[PDB]
């Protein structure tokens, strides 16, 4: 009855970016009350919809997008962005309806000697299209000569960890990002807030 | 379909009243006879009395009489039951049941046929001096295969409700009966084993509803 | 008052065993006696009516016979779905229920998996502490569970549940809470819970230090 949020806000850790999270949420009552009253995050965007008129509103699906990146890269979930993390590993479509939602996470993915565990995919010879996901672990060809599946001389594992360490400034510090996006097709609407 | 639809549940102090419906459907409600069997938890089946619409026939057990009542309204196919003068003993559940038509044999003889064929899903009455309270959810962290839960304590009355993962998981659940504590209050637990490897990567979170307080509380119980 | 009668009041018994309960009533209630089942957590159920009539869509393993003040029903191969407490119910004159006959799965012996959880600092804060311990799918259902504070035996302030026999496995758990104040939390260090039972090879004790 009630959507299933606070399995994708308050939950122990996120996604990378390269393989990040999607929740499919349907068949349910959302209270968006809970999260655009909150002074939790240091970011809340919506495009296309506000998100004061979003309780008395309905969908067809919604989906809630989750995954850590570096502070002074959330800039780039937004809609027609540029940057490694738009390009390579998660990019929102222009005409996005929906909202991006971000806050601080050091005291939870920032660790002594360096949360290594985040990763983030680095080299890439396509953009991603619009809600596109890449998990693929084949070594990039930097240069002339082919890898042929080996690592080596300017032949790269595509992706590269976050060394997330509470020393960090903010910038460099991690985030932890939902993307909600709304959904409305030609079918009864599912998601509805009360 | 023959359907018997029953009250919901009714909380009482020592000493009130309740009255119960059983709503019947699929069938010709008036030349039936309506039974109600209550239930005390734990305890056997104790029959209470019986009343067909249709001829106004009514019978009580010599325990209820005088406190109990069974009425019918042919109109809305419903049978009601009133026990009055309420106490601790009397907390049970309440089913309504219809038995079979009652005949005559070849020489004449009057034979009733009281074969609960079909049966409501029962109404809770708790009669208790406690008011309606909501429970506090409290994590039980696990430290192969793991074990985690929830601690649902200090509420009134039952029932309580408890999903995991906001419904997904359901495999190694166990859900224990609730225990009534000396304070009035019932105390529940609700376990769910799974693998230690896990333990880090799902987040695992116990989702409680009290429906007779409008309390949900949804808590996560995560590795100290 | 008739007076009805049920032998024997529990039982267990294994997948494909031939089960046969009895019912007494006090007179002649001629053949005007029913049998139901009630599985846990749901209503009654007809099963046989009359003494030896089935009723439409229960199995032809459950049979019924008798007459006058002896009764019999039976289960001709106890399947799992069989686990229930079943009643007899005489109508010659008004109406009486049995006391029941608890039926069970007999199991292959199950050692349990022991589990002990400290108290949260949420309910610590609420000036109580509850440990729980936790027996999970082990058959049979008798185990002594002993709470052990500083290895002095613990009394008075526990409670135990035990869960149904599982659908599947045919197993029990159980949960036993002790309930302390933070008082008295505090004032000792090992927290300890001992537990016996047939399937394990000496008595098995999870513990942990405040
Ligand atoms: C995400 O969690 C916050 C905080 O939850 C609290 O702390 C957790 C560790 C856990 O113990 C929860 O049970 C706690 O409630 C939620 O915000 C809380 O919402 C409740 C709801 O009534 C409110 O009473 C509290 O004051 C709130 N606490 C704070 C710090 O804001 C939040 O709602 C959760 N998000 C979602 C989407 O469910």
């Known amino acids: 009855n009630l959507c299933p949020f606070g399995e994708v806000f308050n939950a122990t850790r996120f996604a990378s970016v390269y393989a990040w999270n999607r929740k499919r949420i349907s068949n349910c009552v959302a209270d968006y009350s809970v999260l655009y009253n909150s002074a939790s995050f240091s970011t809340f965007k919506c495009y296309g919809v506000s998100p004061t008129k979003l309780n008395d509103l309905c969908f067809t699906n919604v989906y809630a997008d989750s995954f850590v990146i570096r502070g002074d890269e959330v800039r780039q979930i937004a809609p027609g962005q540029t940057g490694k993390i738009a390009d390579y590993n998660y990019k929102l479509p222009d005409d996005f309806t929906g909202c991006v939602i971000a806050w601080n996470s050091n005291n939870l993915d920032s660790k002594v000697g360096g949360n290594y565990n985040y990763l983030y995919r680095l080299f890439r010879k396509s953009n991603l299209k619009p809600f596109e996901r890449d998990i693929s672990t084949e070594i990039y060809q930097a240069g002339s000569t082919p890898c042929n599946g080996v690592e080596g001389f300017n032949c790269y594992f595509p992706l590269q960890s976050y060394g997330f360490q509470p020393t960090n400034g903010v910038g460099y510090q991690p985030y932890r990002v939902v993307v909600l996006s709304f959904e409305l097709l030609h079918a009864p609407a599912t998601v509805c807030g009360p | 379909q023959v359907q018997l639809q029953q009250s919901g549940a009714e909380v009482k102090k020592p000493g009130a009243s309740v009255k119960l419906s059983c709503k019947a459907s699929?069938?010709?409600?008036?030349?039936?006879?309506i039974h109600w069997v209550r239930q005390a938890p734990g305890q056997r089946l104790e029959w209470m009395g019986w009343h067909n619409a249709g001829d106004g026939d009514t019978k009580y057990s010599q325990k209820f009489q005088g406190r109990v009542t069974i009425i019918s309204d042919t109109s809305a196919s419903t049978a009601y039951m009133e026990l009055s003068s309420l106490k601790s003993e009397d907390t049970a559940v309440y089913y309504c049941?219809?038995?079979?038509?009652?005949?005559?044999?070849?020489?004449?003889?009057?034979?009733?046929?009281?074969?609960?064929?079909?049966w409501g899903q029962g109404t809770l009455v708790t009669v208790s001096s406690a008011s309606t309270k909501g429970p506090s959810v409290f994590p039980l962290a696990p430290s192969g295969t793991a074990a985690l839960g929830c601690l649902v304590k200090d509420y009134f009355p039952e029932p309580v409700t408890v999903s995991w993962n906001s419904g997904a998981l359901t495999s190694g659940v166990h859900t224990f009966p609730a225990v009534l504590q000396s304070s009035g209050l019932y105390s529940l637990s609700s376990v769910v084993t799974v693998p230690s490897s896990s333990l880090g990567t799902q987040t695992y979170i116990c989702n409680v509803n009290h429906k007779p307080s409008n309390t949900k509380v949804d808590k996560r119980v995560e590795p100290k | 008052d008739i007076q009805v009668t049920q032998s024997p009041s529990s039982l267990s018994a294994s997948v494909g065993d031939r089960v046969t309960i009895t019912c007494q009533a006090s007179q002649d209630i001629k053949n005007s006696l029913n049998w139901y089942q009630q599985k846990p957590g749901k209503a009654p159920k007809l099963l046989i009516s009359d003494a030896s009539n089935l009723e439409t869509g229960v199995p032809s393993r459950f049979s019924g016979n008798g007459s006058g003040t002896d009764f019999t029903f039976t289960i001709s191969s106890l399947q799992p779905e069989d686990i229930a407490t079943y009643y007899c119910?005489?109508?010659?004159?008004?109406?009486?229920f049995g006391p029941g006959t608890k039926v069970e799965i007999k199991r292959t012996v199950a050692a349990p998996s022991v589990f002990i959880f400290p108290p949260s600092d949420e309910q610590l804060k609420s000036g109580t502490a509850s440990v729980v311990c936790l027996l999970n799918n082990f058959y049979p259902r008798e185990a002594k569970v002993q709470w052990k504070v500083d290895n002095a035996l613990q009394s008075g302030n526990s409670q135990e549940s035990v869960t149904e026999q599982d659908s599947k496995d045919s197993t029990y758990s159980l949960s036993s809470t002790l309930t302390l104040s933070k008082a008295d939390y505090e004032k000792h260090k090992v927290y300890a819970c001992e537990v016996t039972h047939q399937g394990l090879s000496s008595p098995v004790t999870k513990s942990f230090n405040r």
């Open positions: 049941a219809r038995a079979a038509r009652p005949y005559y044999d070849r020489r004449g003889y009057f034979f009733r046929a009281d074969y609960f064929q079909h």
């Open positions: 699929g069938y010709t409600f008036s030349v039936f006879p």
């Open positions: 119910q005489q109508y010659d004159n008004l109406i009486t």
